[PDB]
């Protein structure tokens, strides 16, 4: 639905984030009854990408499939793919790491701690001695030790990988492997 | 035969894991020529009967429907056939479908309550005491989410017909053991 | 050189697992600028020739086509190249495609019968009536789904060129063993 | 600082596996509020630089872009952040992209020939004619698909930075061993 629509919406997101299938299905049911399918779909895509994210990238991607199914079907049948994804999202590994990393990056810009794009990263089609831009694909492991962060932000670390699921365990390993390579 | 009987038989054959029967009914539906109707039914079947048995296969139905729409008949029949076989021989699960309809039954029968205060939107004792699971170990906190009236409600009973829901089910029960 | 010949050659090269030839014809098509015909044919190839050989790759062709459409040429060529290589080097199956065409043939030749009464839509003979597979073990029930006239029909002959259809095929024959 | 430079630095950082730098330029673009440019560039990066390194990650970019379009800013920044970190830490391959551009080069330099007779469309010399790969073992046939003028051409050179293309690459050389 006595409750406001935004309180049901809030409890829906918090239930899925909180791994409670039954509560999330209860709040989905209330939303289905109220009938704003477009809002359910929007909120479901936010949840999968905010709270599940790198915990299960395939499942987060599958919410978009389910939403496209929902738009094509409409209620009552739309409720079926949404139920499927809600259960999947509730029980998958949770990660907000990428969401928080970008928000840390946005914080530095709004506070004016941003620098300029380093000259070797600028578009050469529009346009200092040295190697210029190094294309990683030419190198072993398709990686080159190169500065990409602006001079003012060379020490910035936004992304702290999590190990709640096997996908981000491996991404995190790669992240620290690169940090070892750079030293 | 009425269109709705062929439709019914199509869904029942896929749910029943009969490739040859499902393809016979698909063929009947293809020959009748209403592609959007076929596509709607397939997405429903994929999500209703396959669901958590093979989430990737259910999602792939949407990909095939999009291909079908862009191609049109006769070529549209090809992604649809591919999908029918996949769904027929994939593990079957109706658990999530049944769980939501049990939740809906509780709401229609007035048995549901109000949003617990800590779950309410704080931007509008609203939200007071809410614990954000991402700060915790395993990204999970013991916290009430169901309304007080439905605190003993149990809608979802995990199936184990496929390895994906096997793993989701283990997590479901793991959480139940954590809460004791 | 004619457009349909290049289109024909494109499909045959991918089906034939020749990356270098498929990319040559893709390039001929890219240079002719008909992005929509590349997209249509690539979705046909993915589902017709790769199909159950790699269902994720056939579905990924739709993602690429959506990217191609959103980007336009020249940038559209990149998602297309990616999936052309993927489709060329993926396991090939035409089994689903051939199975549906076998089912269509039986209908067009008047060998089909009517929907069995237990599969008809109830919302519009003594015995069990329709049995619902989700109630059963392995979510499967022995129940006829083919019409009486087509009760001995086999349309789907599973292939084993990739691990996915191998497992689908194993399930298909298991059901056949269960039914005896 | 110009829009084109931030767009450039964004791609270069992701290609360069720098999560923190990619998110910084992502953030700049989000603050500028051109959602469409982020979406366009991300689809190009996914397919250009990741490509066969992680085909499912490249495809997921399209899912994230569709989510982003339906959500709009500020909420659209969330799916986009997710795919950014994924792409940064995914295996990199530009092999398919470089292969098609090599194929395009031969066409523009007039080194291309005509479609071989057996590959031409049959709906509009002695010997076996067109052989259909699906009739054969491993669904492959030793057959010419490249035009006579380009019979020795090699565009695709498989990389092994990811497990997916490791396998595709092995299949590429297995076909080469079969042809000798």
XYZ file of C-alpha atoms in Angstrom:
723
model
C 0.000 0.000 0.000
C -2.570 2.667 6.207
C 1.152 2.998 5.439
C 2.675 5.464 2.980
C 3.945 4.106 -0.355
C 7.470 5.330 0.436
C 7.519 3.405 3.757
C 6.558 0.125 2.035
C 9.197 0.877 -0.631
C 11.762 1.524 2.132
C 10.868 -1.696 4.018
C 11.044 -3.651 0.725
C 14.635 -2.472 0.013
C 15.708 -3.013 3.643
C 14.229 -6.560 3.727
C 16.081 -7.660 0.557
C 19.318 -5.950 1.693
C 18.760 -7.746 5.011
C 18.373 -11.225 3.471
C 14.794 -11.756 4.695
C 12.919 -13.555 1.889
C 9.562 -13.684 3.699
C 9.535 -10.019 4.679
C 10.629 -8.966 1.183
C 7.868 -11.069 -0.357
C 5.390 -9.557 2.092
C 6.372 -6.026 1.028
C 6.450 -7.000 -2.656
C 2.902 -8.325 -2.198
C 1.752 -5.005 -0.702
C 3.332 -3.138 -3.608
C 1.753 -5.495 -6.164
C -1.632 -4.909 -4.478
C -1.132 -1.124 -4.714
C -0.404 -1.655 -8.422
C 2.447 0.712 -9.308
C 4.453 -1.820 -11.342
C 6.797 0.817 -12.823
C 7.889 1.787 -9.289
C 8.402 -1.831 -8.150
C 10.584 -2.426 -11.219
C 12.659 0.712 -10.620
C 13.218 -0.088 -6.962
C 14.124 -3.710 -7.750
C 16.897 -2.625 -10.175
C 18.260 -0.178 -7.545
C 18.314 -2.899 -4.851
C 20.098 -5.503 -7.012
C 22.792 -3.059 -8.032
C 23.099 -1.225 -4.693
C 22.946 -4.057 -2.203
C 23.849 -7.177 -4.176
C 26.122 -5.598 -6.810
C 29.479 -7.398 -7.052
C 28.190 -10.007 -4.597
C 26.385 -11.510 -7.598
C 26.752 -9.455 -10.853
C 24.744 -12.021 -12.880
C 21.796 -11.821 -10.459
C 21.963 -8.022 -10.471
C 21.940 -8.160 -14.279
C 19.001 -10.633 -14.190
C 16.774 -8.019 -12.498
C 16.801 -6.062 -15.758
C 15.647 -9.195 -17.643
C 12.833 -9.667 -15.092
C 11.800 -5.994 -15.386
C 11.599 -6.236 -19.189
C 9.457 -9.337 -18.683
C 7.232 -7.362 -16.219
C 6.697 -4.421 -18.634
C 5.717 -6.845 -21.414
C 3.369 -8.843 -19.154
C 1.844 -6.279 -16.800
C 0.168 -7.293 -13.554
C -1.029 -9.852 -12.467
C 1.550 -12.000 -14.324
C 4.419 -9.492 -13.860
C 4.548 -10.537 -10.184
C 6.106 -13.891 -11.152
C 9.512 -12.775 -12.529
C 9.677 -10.185 -9.699
C 9.173 -12.899 -7.058
C 11.938 -14.964 -8.650
C 14.428 -12.111 -8.532
C 13.469 -11.015 -5.014
C 14.237 -14.475 -3.576
C 17.482 -14.678 -5.595
C 18.539 -11.173 -4.457
C 17.675 -11.868 -0.776
C 19.807 -15.005 -0.700
C 22.794 -13.948 -2.851
C 25.985 -12.410 -1.397
C 25.573 -8.727 -0.574
C 28.000 -6.021 -1.623
C 27.700 -2.251 -1.578
C 31.434 -1.753 -2.273
C 31.123 -0.295 -5.792
C 28.258 2.006 -4.742
C 30.302 3.286 -1.790
C 33.495 3.622 -3.867
C 31.799 5.875 -6.424
C 30.199 7.906 -3.629
C 33.660 8.374 -2.060
C 34.873 9.503 -5.504
C 31.941 11.931 -5.848
C 32.725 13.358 -2.391
C 36.237 14.395 -3.493
C 34.870 16.252 -6.554
C 32.148 18.197 -4.733
C 34.719 19.278 -2.131
C 36.963 20.469 -4.997
C 39.777 17.962 -4.358
C 39.692 16.953 -8.038
C 42.647 17.592 -10.341
C 42.966 17.855 -14.116
C 43.096 14.970 -16.598
C 46.827 14.081 -16.953
C 48.091 15.107 -20.403
C 48.786 11.540 -21.571
C 45.132 10.595 -20.882
C 43.670 13.396 -23.015
C 42.015 12.771 -26.384
C 44.778 12.709 -29.013
C 42.303 13.534 -31.815
C 41.983 17.034 -30.284
C 45.301 17.173 -28.315
C 56.266 17.104 -22.497
C 58.995 14.505 -23.192
C 58.427 10.774 -22.678
C 56.562 7.570 -23.554
C 53.127 9.224 -23.940
C 50.052 7.036 -23.518
C 50.821 3.331 -23.055
C 48.175 0.961 -24.474
C 47.821 -1.991 -21.989
C 46.846 -4.554 -24.656
C 50.488 -4.541 -25.889
C 51.782 -5.744 -22.522
C 51.974 -8.990 -20.539
C 48.634 -9.728 -18.797
C 47.202 -6.727 -20.720
C 48.385 -4.373 -17.960
C 50.891 -1.519 -17.827
C 52.187 0.417 -14.792
C 50.754 3.830 -15.674
C 49.295 6.820 -13.803
C 45.559 7.286 -14.425
C 44.561 9.251 -11.312
C 45.056 13.065 -11.514
C 48.095 14.477 -9.660
C 45.975 15.859 -6.782
C 44.354 12.433 -6.255
C 47.331 10.073 -6.765
C 46.912 8.606 -3.257
C 43.100 8.212 -3.403
C 41.648 4.796 -2.629
C 37.893 4.546 -3.144
C 37.388 0.834 -3.673
C 37.674 -1.564 -0.781
C 36.830 -5.048 -2.104
C 34.676 -7.452 -0.141
C 34.698 -11.233 0.085
C 31.004 -11.930 0.711
C 30.901 -13.862 -2.570
C 33.305 -15.779 -4.824
C 33.074 -13.267 -7.676
C 34.363 -10.309 -5.648
C 36.881 -12.511 -3.804
C 38.549 -12.920 -7.195
C 38.101 -9.253 -8.204
C 39.625 -8.237 -4.875
C 42.560 -10.589 -5.443
C 43.160 -8.917 -8.822
C 42.856 -5.481 -7.165
C 45.591 -6.233 -4.602
C 47.703 -8.099 -7.190
C 47.818 -4.862 -9.216
C 48.807 -2.906 -6.079
C 51.683 -5.368 -5.544
C 52.730 -5.004 -9.209
C 52.852 -1.200 -8.882
C 55.443 -1.387 -6.051
C -9.110 -26.594 -30.490
C -9.389 -23.184 -28.893
C -6.248 -21.047 -28.654
C -6.420 -21.116 -24.836
C -6.277 -24.941 -24.782
C -3.115 -25.051 -26.948
C -1.703 -22.329 -24.677
C -2.527 -24.414 -21.594
C -1.046 -27.582 -23.129
C 2.128 -25.696 -24.132
C 2.682 -24.488 -20.530
C 1.839 -27.926 -19.079
C 4.224 -29.755 -21.455
C 7.184 -27.486 -20.624
C 6.425 -27.681 -16.872
C 6.168 -31.457 -17.360
C 9.604 -31.694 -19.061
C 8.216 -33.002 -22.384
C 10.337 -31.422 -25.156
C 8.492 -33.166 -27.989
C 5.030 -32.266 -26.683
C 6.080 -28.658 -25.971
C 7.502 -28.330 -29.470
C 4.281 -29.738 -30.938
C 2.258 -27.040 -29.170
C 4.822 -24.353 -30.013
C 4.422 -25.391 -33.660
C 0.613 -25.071 -33.351
C 1.001 -21.617 -31.790
C 3.564 -20.533 -34.427
C 1.186 -21.676 -37.187
C -1.645 -19.642 -35.590
C 0.686 -16.606 -35.943
C 0.268 -14.570 -32.716
C 3.935 -14.104 -31.810
C 3.516 -11.630 -28.918
C 1.134 -14.041 -27.219
C 3.640 -16.930 -27.577
C 6.400 -14.697 -26.132
C 4.265 -13.658 -23.140
C 3.468 -17.303 -22.331
C 7.113 -18.397 -22.604
C 8.363 -15.670 -20.238
C 5.582 -16.651 -17.789
C 6.490 -20.369 -18.041
C 10.222 -19.623 -17.716
C 9.662 -17.626 -14.560
C 6.746 -19.624 -13.063
C 7.876 -23.210 -13.554
C 11.630 -22.989 -14.060
C 12.330 -19.901 -11.879
C 14.983 -20.646 -9.264
C 15.636 -24.058 -10.886
C 17.633 -22.179 -13.541
C 17.586 -18.342 -13.104
C 19.927 -17.862 -16.081
C 17.585 -19.906 -18.331
C 14.556 -17.899 -17.166
C 16.431 -14.653 -17.887
C 17.513 -16.034 -21.303
C 13.827 -16.349 -22.311
C 13.640 -12.545 -22.245
C 16.695 -12.390 -24.543
C 14.957 -14.833 -26.953
C 11.678 -12.866 -26.855
C 13.597 -9.668 -27.717
C 15.219 -11.539 -30.636
C 11.793 -12.895 -31.658
C 10.283 -9.383 -31.682
C 13.155 -7.968 -33.763
C 13.063 -10.892 -36.230
C 9.361 -11.710 -36.509
C 7.978 -14.984 -37.878
C 9.163 -17.286 -39.447
C 12.706 -16.709 -38.018
C 11.330 -15.851 -34.550
C 10.437 -19.545 -34.129
C 14.161 -20.365 -33.799
C 15.049 -18.578 -30.544
C 11.694 -19.781 -29.157
C 12.506 -23.427 -29.980
C 15.977 -23.116 -28.394
C 14.374 -21.760 -25.238
C 11.554 -24.348 -25.058
C 14.069 -27.231 -25.031
C 16.273 -25.502 -22.433
C 13.269 -24.855 -20.122
C 11.924 -28.424 -20.634
C 15.182 -30.055 -19.513
C 16.198 -27.490 -16.852
C 15.444 -28.146 -13.154
C 11.890 -27.073 -12.278
C 11.007 -24.799 -9.382
C 7.822 -22.956 -8.478
C 8.947 -21.974 -4.969
C 9.203 -18.182 -5.438
C 5.900 -18.040 -7.352
C 4.151 -19.945 -4.572
C 5.830 -17.905 -1.818
C 4.615 -14.567 -3.182
C 1.067 -15.875 -3.665
C 1.056 -17.048 -0.027
C 2.185 -13.516 0.920
C -0.596 -11.993 -1.215
C -3.185 -14.304 0.393
C -2.143 -12.975 3.842
C -2.621 -9.358 2.656
C -6.020 -9.959 1.002
C -7.245 -11.710 4.171
C -6.296 -8.632 6.247
C -3.689 -10.581 8.277
C -0.877 -8.123 7.533
C 0.228 -5.283 9.792
C 2.084 -1.988 9.585
C 5.668 -1.211 8.582
C 7.889 -1.465 11.706
C 9.127 2.013 12.654
C 12.828 1.263 12.011
C 12.026 0.267 8.413
C 10.188 3.502 7.571
C 11.789 6.102 5.318
C 13.870 8.456 7.477
C 13.937 11.238 4.843
C 10.231 12.005 5.402
C 10.320 7.354 15.565
C 10.845 6.743 11.854
C 13.919 4.747 10.814
C 15.189 4.994 14.383
C 17.516 2.130 15.303
C 17.802 0.708 11.759
C 20.925 -1.444 11.317
C 22.565 -1.417 7.884
C 23.628 -5.047 7.103
C 26.722 -4.003 5.082
C 28.529 -2.875 8.275
C 28.243 -6.385 9.696
C 30.102 -9.672 9.213
C 28.749 -11.759 6.282
C 26.850 -8.539 5.348
C 24.012 -9.664 7.642
C 22.396 -8.355 10.822
C 19.797 -10.019 13.045
C 16.945 -7.549 12.614
C 13.144 -7.755 12.422
C 11.749 -7.011 8.948
C 8.281 -8.636 8.997
C 5.448 -6.639 10.651
C 4.552 -7.702 14.234
C 1.298 -9.306 13.005
C 3.263 -11.521 10.599
C 6.351 -12.259 12.739
C 5.878 -16.044 12.449
C 4.947 -15.994 8.735
C 6.851 -18.323 6.451
C 6.139 -18.059 2.734
C 9.288 -19.417 1.095
C 10.191 -23.084 1.268
C 13.333 -23.713 -0.795
C 13.476 -26.541 -3.306
C 16.603 -28.509 -4.248
C 15.762 -29.628 -7.808
C 18.757 -27.639 -9.046
C 22.173 -26.643 -7.672
C 21.396 -22.919 -7.718
C 18.381 -23.181 -5.394
C 20.239 -25.823 -3.364
C 22.777 -23.075 -2.530
C 20.099 -20.422 -1.917
C 18.273 -22.894 0.340
C 21.399 -23.532 2.417
C 21.754 -19.770 2.949
C 18.047 -19.518 3.839
C 18.453 -22.125 6.606
C 21.868 -20.724 7.654
C 20.129 -17.381 8.394
C 17.414 -19.246 10.349
C 20.129 -20.914 12.460
C 21.882 -17.553 12.979
C 18.602 -16.138 14.345
C 18.558 -18.681 17.231
C 28.653 -8.981 -55.473
C 25.067 -9.389 -54.219
C 23.910 -8.539 -50.695
C 22.203 -11.901 -50.146
C 25.348 -13.767 -51.177
C 27.434 -11.875 -48.592
C 24.696 -12.481 -45.991
C 24.603 -16.175 -46.942
C 28.418 -16.379 -46.762
C 28.436 -14.666 -43.343
C 26.077 -17.302 -41.834
C 27.898 -20.260 -43.420
C 31.297 -19.041 -42.139
C 30.091 -18.715 -38.539
C 28.242 -22.084 -38.696
C 31.471 -23.401 -40.258
C 33.691 -22.120 -37.402
C 35.873 -19.927 -39.621
C 36.546 -16.759 -37.608
C 38.612 -15.099 -40.328
C 36.034 -15.640 -43.077
C 33.137 -14.556 -40.808
C 34.996 -11.357 -39.919
C 35.721 -10.729 -43.611
C 31.999 -10.929 -44.433
C 31.070 -8.913 -41.339
C 33.516 -6.254 -42.632
C 31.867 -6.344 -46.087
C 28.514 -5.847 -44.358
C 29.857 -3.107 -42.031
C 31.256 -1.252 -45.091
C 27.900 -1.543 -46.904
C 26.391 0.125 -43.812
C 23.271 -2.004 -43.321
C 23.598 -2.422 -39.555
C 20.043 -3.766 -39.157
C 20.640 -6.703 -41.526
C 23.843 -7.643 -39.690
C 21.908 -7.603 -36.409
C 18.993 -9.677 -37.709
C 21.244 -12.314 -39.288
C 23.579 -12.493 -36.257
C 20.640 -13.216 -33.950
C 19.441 -15.878 -36.467
C 22.937 -17.478 -36.537
C 23.328 -17.428 -32.729
C 20.042 -19.228 -32.196
C 19.991 -21.456 -35.326
C 23.567 -22.723 -35.512
C 24.914 -22.287 -31.988
C 21.630 -22.676 -30.096
C 21.922 -25.285 -27.364
C 25.693 -25.541 -28.041
C 26.112 -22.334 -26.029
C 22.784 -20.788 -24.828
C 24.578 -17.959 -22.999
C 26.395 -17.021 -26.244
C 23.123 -16.972 -28.240
C 21.520 -14.777 -25.555
C 24.648 -12.548 -25.486
C 24.079 -11.862 -29.213
C 20.911 -9.961 -28.211
C 22.914 -7.849 -25.722
C 25.406 -7.077 -28.509
C 22.645 -6.125 -30.970
C 21.115 -3.768 -28.395
C 24.574 -2.202 -27.919
C 25.074 -2.035 -31.709
C 21.695 -0.311 -32.154
C 22.404 2.189 -29.355
C 25.896 2.939 -30.643
C 25.413 2.901 -34.409
C 28.250 2.554 -36.914
C 31.274 2.798 -36.743
C 31.255 1.817 -33.017
C 28.525 -0.829 -33.492
C 31.145 -3.005 -35.214
C 32.892 -3.807 -31.892
C 30.127 -5.671 -30.057
C 29.385 -7.455 -33.380
C 33.030 -8.555 -33.858
C 33.163 -9.890 -30.284
C 30.119 -12.113 -30.687
C 31.097 -13.246 -34.210
C 34.349 -14.665 -32.789
C 32.443 -16.159 -29.806
C 29.812 -17.764 -32.087
C 32.437 -19.140 -34.543
C 34.418 -20.852 -31.776
C 31.464 -22.030 -29.659
C 29.987 -25.568 -29.777
C 27.398 -25.908 -32.548
C 23.923 -27.336 -32.229
C 20.995 -27.136 -34.613
C 18.940 -29.701 -32.674
C 16.202 -27.402 -31.306
C 15.845 -25.728 -34.702
C 15.476 -29.107 -36.398
C 13.136 -30.503 -33.724
C 10.582 -27.700 -34.116
C 10.657 -27.984 -37.914
C 9.968 -31.724 -37.470
C 7.001 -30.796 -35.229
C 5.747 -28.247 -37.787
C 5.979 -30.883 -40.554
C 3.640 -33.242 -38.652
C 1.035 -30.470 -38.347
C 1.290 -29.325 -41.973
C 0.820 -32.948 -43.094
C -2.283 -33.381 -40.899
C -0.725 -35.975 -38.584
C -1.529 -33.946 -35.446
C -4.466 -34.591 -33.127
C -6.399 -32.600 -30.533
C -5.241 -31.354 -27.116
C -5.748 -34.219 -24.589
C -8.607 -33.373 -22.205
C -6.406 -33.264 -19.081
C -4.253 -30.483 -20.627
C -7.176 -28.197 -21.466
C -7.672 -24.881 -19.642
C -9.870 -25.624 -16.617
C -10.877 -21.936 -16.294
C -13.059 -22.465 -19.394
C -13.732 -39.821 -18.112
C -12.719 -41.186 -14.685
C -9.249 -40.750 -13.192
C -6.505 -38.523 -11.809
C -7.042 -35.568 -14.190
C -4.168 -33.130 -14.642
C -1.219 -33.818 -12.329
C 1.015 -30.917 -11.301
C 4.732 -31.881 -11.535
C 5.874 -29.500 -8.763
C 4.030 -31.687 -6.180
C 6.228 -34.646 -7.189
C 9.799 -35.912 -6.678
C 12.371 -34.301 -9.033
C 9.427 -32.021 -9.957
C 8.366 -34.619 -12.542
C 5.306 -36.798 -13.168
C 4.653 -39.574 -15.706
C 1.797 -38.041 -17.677
C 1.047 -37.856 -21.388
C 1.413 -34.441 -23.017
C 1.546 -35.393 -26.696
C -1.813 -35.911 -28.427
C -2.910 -39.556 -28.913
C -2.147 -39.446 -32.672
C 1.401 -38.174 -32.026
C 2.054 -40.371 -28.954
C 5.121 -42.033 -30.524
C 6.647 -38.857 -32.012
C 10.275 -37.968 -31.440
C 11.314 -34.547 -32.667
C 14.280 -33.761 -30.451
C 17.498 -35.683 -30.887
C 20.027 -34.171 -28.438
C 23.591 -33.453 -29.478
C 26.737 -33.513 -27.356
C 29.008 -30.937 -29.020
C 29.048 -28.844 -25.845
C 28.720 -29.616 -22.134
C 25.393 -27.794 -21.745
C 23.421 -29.851 -24.287
C 25.316 -32.953 -23.027
C 23.602 -32.434 -19.661
C 20.260 -31.554 -21.313
C 20.600 -34.745 -23.378
C 21.360 -36.802 -20.257
C 18.160 -35.488 -18.652
C 16.150 -36.218 -21.829
C 17.132 -39.911 -21.787
C 16.647 -40.146 -17.998
C 13.004 -39.066 -18.468
C 12.716 -41.735 -21.202
C 14.091 -44.350 -18.768
C 11.669 -43.087 -16.097
C 8.727 -43.472 -18.505
C 9.497 -47.182 -19.133
C 38.779 20.508 -18.497
C 37.016 19.322 -21.683
C 34.290 16.636 -21.914
C 36.237 14.653 -24.548
C 39.311 14.416 -22.277
C 37.333 13.029 -19.305
C 35.593 10.597 -21.691
C 39.066 9.545 -22.940
C 40.542 9.213 -19.418
C 37.525 7.147 -18.311
C 38.136 4.538 -21.070
C 41.922 4.570 -20.545
C 41.579 3.956 -16.782
C 39.160 1.009 -17.216
C 41.369 -0.494 -19.969
C 44.257 0.108 -17.571
C 42.567 -1.832 -14.717
C 42.560 1.212 -12.394
C 39.346 1.015 -10.345
C 39.985 4.211 -8.381
C 40.856 6.289 -11.438
C 37.905 4.891 -13.397
C 35.494 5.752 -10.585
C 36.997 9.245 -10.273
C 36.289 9.965 -13.966
C 32.932 8.190 -13.660
C 32.151 10.588 -10.793
C 33.190 13.620 -12.911
C 30.853 12.491 -15.685
C 28.037 11.830 -13.175
C 28.554 15.360 -11.749
C 28.407 16.818 -15.292
C 25.140 14.914 -15.682
C 25.502 13.464 -19.170
C 24.225 9.966 -18.448
C 24.073 9.021 -22.142
C 27.818 9.620 -22.727
C 28.763 7.378 -19.798
C 26.401 4.689 -21.104
C 27.761 4.905 -24.675
C 31.394 4.853 -23.583
C 30.849 1.987 -21.123
C 29.289 -0.211 -23.815
C 32.257 0.549 -26.129
C 34.828 -0.170 -23.348
C 33.062 -3.399 -22.366
C 33.189 -4.664 -25.938
C 36.519 -3.095 -27.034
C 38.805 -3.670 -24.072
C 37.227 -6.523 -22.131
C 35.531 -8.311 -25.022
C 36.483 -11.975 -25.084
C 38.348 -11.550 -21.756
C 34.961 -11.701 -20.024
C 32.030 -11.965 -22.509
C 29.365 -12.068 -19.773
C 30.779 -8.912 -18.154
C 30.650 -7.115 -21.527
C 27.031 -8.246 -22.013
C 26.105 -7.150 -18.454
C 27.127 -3.581 -19.402
C 24.068 -3.533 -21.665
C 21.855 -4.661 -18.723
C 23.360 -1.906 -16.542
C 22.842 0.702 -19.266
C 19.166 -0.271 -19.616
C 18.776 -0.047 -15.816
C 20.515 3.360 -15.931
C 18.144 4.691 -18.632
C 15.043 3.568 -16.721
C 16.374 4.888 -13.383
C 17.984 8.157 -14.454
C 20.466 10.119 -12.369
C 21.190 10.084 -9.455
C 20.182 6.383 -9.024
C 21.664 5.397 -12.420
C 25.152 5.925 -11.005
C 24.735 2.657 -9.014
C 24.533 0.031 -11.861
C 27.202 2.005 -13.706
C 29.605 1.931 -10.734
C 29.102 -1.846 -10.458
C 30.020 -2.598 -14.074
C 32.970 -0.183 -13.872
C 34.678 -2.155 -11.049
C 33.805 -5.433 -12.811
C 35.302 -4.311 -16.140
C 38.429 -2.885 -14.432
C 39.257 -6.178 -12.758
C 38.077 -8.464 -15.591
C 40.604 -10.024 -18.034
C 41.289 -7.714 -20.973
C 41.086 -8.645 -24.629
C 40.975 -6.459 -27.726
C 41.549 -9.462 -30.037
C 38.154 -9.505 -31.797
C 38.184 -5.716 -32.210
C 41.695 -5.826 -33.727
C 40.669 -8.788 -35.928
C 37.708 -7.045 -37.585
C 39.733 -3.853 -38.177
C 42.353 -6.045 -39.894
C 39.513 -7.528 -42.013
C 38.205 -4.021 -42.789
C 41.698 -2.899 -43.873
C 41.908 -5.609 -46.571
C 38.509 -4.560 -47.967
C 39.391 -0.843 -48.086
C 42.695 -1.664 -49.821
C 40.764 -3.722 -52.417
C 42.425 -7.022 -51.449
C 38.997 -8.678 -51.114
C 37.548 -11.053 -53.708
C 34.127 -12.416 -54.611
C 31.924 -14.726 -52.526
C 32.910 -18.364 -53.340
C 30.232 -20.079 -55.457
C 29.268 -22.688 -52.849
C 28.587 -19.978 -50.221
C 26.184 -18.006 -52.414
C 22.455 -17.925 -51.632
C 20.782 -20.955 -53.221
C 17.292 -19.397 -53.250
C 18.230 -16.968 -56.064
C 31.696 -26.625 -61.706
C 31.489 -30.198 -60.424
C 31.715 -31.488 -56.900
C 30.254 -31.756 -53.531
C 28.657 -28.221 -53.298
C 27.971 -26.555 -49.993
C 28.528 -28.875 -47.059
C 26.449 -28.278 -43.944
C 28.634 -28.560 -40.760
C 25.788 -29.929 -38.609
C 25.726 -33.190 -40.639
C 29.333 -33.879 -39.563
C 31.273 -35.090 -36.508
C 32.049 -32.239 -34.033
C 29.659 -30.159 -36.233
C 32.620 -29.079 -38.375
C 33.628 -29.625 -42.014
C 36.892 -28.855 -43.872
C 35.457 -26.272 -46.266
C 36.636 -23.008 -47.848
C 34.845 -19.886 -46.605
C 37.403 -17.159 -47.375
C 37.381 -15.782 -50.952
C 40.188 -17.010 -53.250
C 42.102 -13.692 -52.995
C 42.105 -13.886 -49.179
C 42.686 -17.642 -48.761
C 45.813 -17.072 -46.620
C 44.404 -14.231 -44.462
C 44.659 -14.322 -40.676
C 42.801 -11.639 -38.735
C 42.116 -13.261 -35.389
C 44.953 -13.921 -32.991
C 43.551 -15.473 -29.767
C 44.620 -14.154 -26.382
C 44.808 -16.121 -23.154
C 44.307 -13.386 -20.516
C 40.979 -14.960 -19.595
C 39.817 -18.567 -19.303
C 36.945 -18.042 -21.754
C 39.214 -16.975 -24.610
C 41.859 -19.538 -23.558
C 39.275 -22.184 -24.563
C 38.163 -20.321 -27.713
C 41.837 -19.958 -28.688
C 42.496 -23.681 -28.224
C 39.500 -24.420 -30.456
C 40.890 -21.944 -33.041
C 44.191 -23.873 -33.241
C 42.418 -27.266 -33.083
C 40.585 -26.287 -36.286
C 43.970 -25.268 -37.772
C 45.393 -28.705 -36.871
C 42.344 -30.353 -38.481
C 42.889 -28.474 -41.753
C 46.505 -29.690 -42.161
